[PDB]
Amino acid sequence: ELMIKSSNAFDVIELSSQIQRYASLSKINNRTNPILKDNKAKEFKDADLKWLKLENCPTAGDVPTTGNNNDLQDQFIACDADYRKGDLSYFGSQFEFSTYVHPSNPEIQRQIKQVVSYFQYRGMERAFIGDAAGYVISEAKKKGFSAQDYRIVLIEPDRVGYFESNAISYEEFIENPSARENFLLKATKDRTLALAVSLAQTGEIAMQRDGSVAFLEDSELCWDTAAGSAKSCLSVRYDTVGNKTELDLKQIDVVSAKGLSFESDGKTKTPVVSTYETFQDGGRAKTINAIECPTGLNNRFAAVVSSFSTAGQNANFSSESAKDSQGTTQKDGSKGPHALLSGISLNWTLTNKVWDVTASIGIESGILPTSGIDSGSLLRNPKSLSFIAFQWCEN
Amino acid sequence: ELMIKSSNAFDVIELSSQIQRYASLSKINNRTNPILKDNKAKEFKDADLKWLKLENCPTAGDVPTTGNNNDLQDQFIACDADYRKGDLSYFGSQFEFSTYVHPSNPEIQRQIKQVVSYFQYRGMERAFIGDAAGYVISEAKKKGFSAQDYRIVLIEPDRVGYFESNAISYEEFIENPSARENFLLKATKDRTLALAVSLAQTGEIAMQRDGSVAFLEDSELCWDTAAGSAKSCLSVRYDTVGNKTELDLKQIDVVSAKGLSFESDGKTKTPVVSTYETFQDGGRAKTINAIECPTGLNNRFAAVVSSFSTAGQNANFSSESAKDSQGTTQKDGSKGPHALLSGISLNWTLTNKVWDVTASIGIESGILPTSGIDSGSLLRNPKSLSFIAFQWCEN
Amino acid sequence: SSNAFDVIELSSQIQRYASLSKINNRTNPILKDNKAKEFKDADLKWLKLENCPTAGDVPTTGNNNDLQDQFIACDADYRKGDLSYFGSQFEFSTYVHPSNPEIQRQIKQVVSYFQYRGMERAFIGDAAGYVISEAKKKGFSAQDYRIVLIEPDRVGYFESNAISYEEFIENPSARENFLLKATKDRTLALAVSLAQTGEIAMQRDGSVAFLEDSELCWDTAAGSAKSCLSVRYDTVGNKTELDLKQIDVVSAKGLSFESDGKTKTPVVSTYETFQDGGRAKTINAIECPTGLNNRFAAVVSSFSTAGQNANFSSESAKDSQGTTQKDGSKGPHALLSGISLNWTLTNKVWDVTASIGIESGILPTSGIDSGSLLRNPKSLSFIAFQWCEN
């Protein structure tokens, strides 16, 4: 049906839907919602609706615009709009709040709990605000407007707003003539009779792509998966025991990263990675490519002893499951028994994105030839050695 | 007017989406969803909807509050809501579950698989439930819900609720008069004719701040970035081959964390972090500060040999790229050749967030003087030693 | 029924379509031409997927594994109701594509016409009311919102007459003025062109992205700047970062990362010593994530030449009672020539063995240790490292 039964009922919904849209927003035209900057638990916004109009109106409203009148602006009602019309005449809205610290917007100091909008009845006979109410409720459903309560109220002026001296639910106004005229008594001359439209702020508020809206405390971000109907979720939770926040990824079996860094006592590192290393024949350094470091982090390295013997070049330690060790070179150049050991040196230097590792094993004197890779009292870059190389980045 | 059908339908979808919302939350107002604590496979909730109302209602419902009434309390339906009216009248909902361990919530014992909400038909000609159901499907599309999988059922009571004895798809009820009239034939006086609603959300549904809307399977969470037009995305996926979920973060170059923990065969670890260590002059114990462990984790330490010789005090190993080693102290007190080695001990003890590290090197007898840091057959906490200290936390 | 919802829903979808160069990683078909104007028809074949029972025009990725981006359903027909879909008029401008010689234009403008078929033509003002209220509800603005009469043109239609929505509503003289020109050579229609003026929400299908530098945040009791995360692009390193650093601890189950293109898990360590008796040591291999293989490395921590006559199992102190002499008794510690640590993976268990070479002529000629070799000695502690990699 595209025919408007009651123009007035239509207007009540049209205005209400925009009040709802406004109450759901933390930002408007990329600026904080004005209503959220104060810290009182209540505020009454006036029937003239200046507070709902753009600040670039001929008469300037309270709703922020972007830097430029250049761009299209988000808006709620026309600059000249007036809803103080008809039998149900807009009377203003009561906003209720609670204190709120937004995790990322410092300008926000409270959050909307509930918005109660009042539409004063100006029909000749008070009782038939009941009929008026019903057409509003009908029109809500027709226009897909979802409010959380409709009530008939009596409101008196307050210190800075209005309060409800008496309230009766819509249902009990039509379907309970005992409570109905129990309520209309109180309709004295400094009280205003009105339809009250309540909007509760629920978990249904949309997560905006600008990140202006936070996930509720203890809520979860979830995926459907091919595992079936079980959802895979993650969350940020705060534990009072220890007073630390946690990004809880434990419903997921594997977190799969590319680059990865973390902090240890203030310092930033990447996870250590390790390799098994031995020297090649010939007595030269073992060259190991330096890992690539993320921005701002420097290369680190450590070599530690795994296996060793005093055989020097006469060995093969490259297999992780067995060691071949043929003895120490004797003065006549032949392989003899394994000499006794006095020390091991492992040195490393980074040049040009390559680590050069050098080593020597010190042995008892008088065994080795005077000259050569194994000579004097030293086995140089020996094959009779395996080490584990550790690499990581840090700042 | 016969737009009583569309209005009845609006309420059906309104209630059904709140029921679906409730079913998707493991916590409500910071407390475990009451329906997830038990361990049965199914449960039927009653048409009176007490279970869906807040416990702070004049007549208390079962939905928890935060405790502090100052707080915004999330809610699903009004305290005086009653959806047992109209041609499609709420009759209760069937929840099916599977057993479940929540990694961070010990109070949870099961997981919702699905919820079906039943609306019994109170029209006097049964055949016209198809017509009523069409309005429901229409109200569903308007709110972003799927138009598929609606069913017309016959349900009967048993001790734990109502079960379906017969079912036909909305589509077959409409198009296949033979199937329709065969289904209706089983609609005996003892069975309740109902529309079975199980809402499914289209991909266009907005994400909500309570987390109750999950991402579609294979959907990603994406950010615009200064890199240009390409998005940067993460996703949660289930591999049917390995039967594991993965949080794929690889499309991002670096995952940058503060504290970090992970699991290895059921145990919680932090990443190993390492320092290069040597003893300072004088032969005394060394102190290394313990890393700060996340709540619940305990400090671990391991020291491994990197370089060593029998020089004892006559050495400097503090550089990673060179070693100064000047031989073992002889009996006259002068530096001599390097003595031969029998062993190396690295020892460590945790005291008040400090690791006390001691070391010694056993050597052949009859070299060292009889007194001093290096004496007898022992080099105490020698300088001629470098070791890598590994630290991590675990439970 | 759902007429007003439908008008805005179709119009938004068409607008979305219009705004897209590719649909399902294939060129938007409407761009593969060079004409300045095209009218697309009421039956909406052009907006339906090609894989519909009756083929539509919207391309497909080819493989049905993933959900195919779509606009309307295969059976959709919006030619009902008092606001009945009449077709969409697109205006284009010239374009030269860098890689596809068939793309020769880009969209400049689209308007969707919904013809009026209500009992009384005057009631189109009411119908336009529901539409505009729905449109604004969803964060849209209509561009030149107007009621029109259209006649067939060279291409598509031209608007022979038009009245703004406000004029039709607030000027009864302008309205019948317009309404009387409604002859048989024209169709009465609502002309809808939607612009997104509200900020939009993140969506279940993941099609909408967080804005550059947006933070995704969670309320907590810890307060500000402790529960937010973001993806930012560092302009100096030209790298993207997932920034979790506000949160005290990221707590994972399994975890993998890449080192120079290779996938790893973090190394995990244990303190190990051999049991009495010279037997080999078994260490259970950690569980690897799908497609990774086990790695192991043992390194020396403490040792002596005591062999069996020792206890190194305590991390804080070492007992070493000397080397077994020829008569089988405990004597002085022998001198050393080497240490081997060996390991082999067999059926999810790492078998670890060790030997310490020592000076000859000390050990007895038979027994647990003989010759010049200590096998799997107690006088040793090593650190064992495990990780997975591909």
Residue numbers in the entry:
A (entry chain B), B (entry chain C): 29 to 423
C (entry chain A): 34 to 423
Provide text from the study.
The toxin-coregulated pilus (TCP), an operon-encoded type IVb pilus (T4bP), plays a crucial role in this process, which requires an additional secreted protein, TcpF, encoded on the same TCP operon; however, its mechanisms of secretion and function remain elusive. Repetitive TcpA units form the filament structure, whereas TcpB displays multiple functions, such as efficient pilus assembly, pilus retraction, and CTXφ uptake. The structural analyses reveal how TCP recognizes TcpF and its secretory mechanism via TcpB-dependent pilus elongation and retraction.
TcpB comprises three domains, of which the crystal structures of C-terminal domains (domain 2 and domain 3) were recently resolved, showing that these two domains consist of β-strand–rich folds forming a homotrimeric pilus initiation complex. The structure of TcpB domain 1 remains unknown and is predicted to be a pilin-like domain based on the similarity of its sequence with other T4b pilins. We then analyzed the structure of TcpB alone and in complex with the TcpF (1–15) peptide. The α/β loop of TcpB consists of 64 residues, which are remarkably longer than the 38 residues of major pilin TcpA, and has a disulfide bond formed between Cys85 and Cys107 in the loop. In general, type IV pilins form a disulfide bond in the D-region; however, TcpB has a disulfide bond between Cys85 and Cys107 in the α/β loop instead of the D-region. To confirm the association of TcpB and TcpF in solution, we performed sedimentation velocity-analytical ultracentrifugation. The crystal structure of TcpB domain 1 that was determined here allows us to simulate this situation by replacing one TcpA molecule at the bottom of the TCP filament model with one TcpB subunit. In this model, Glu5 of TcpB can interact with the Met1 amine of TcpA.
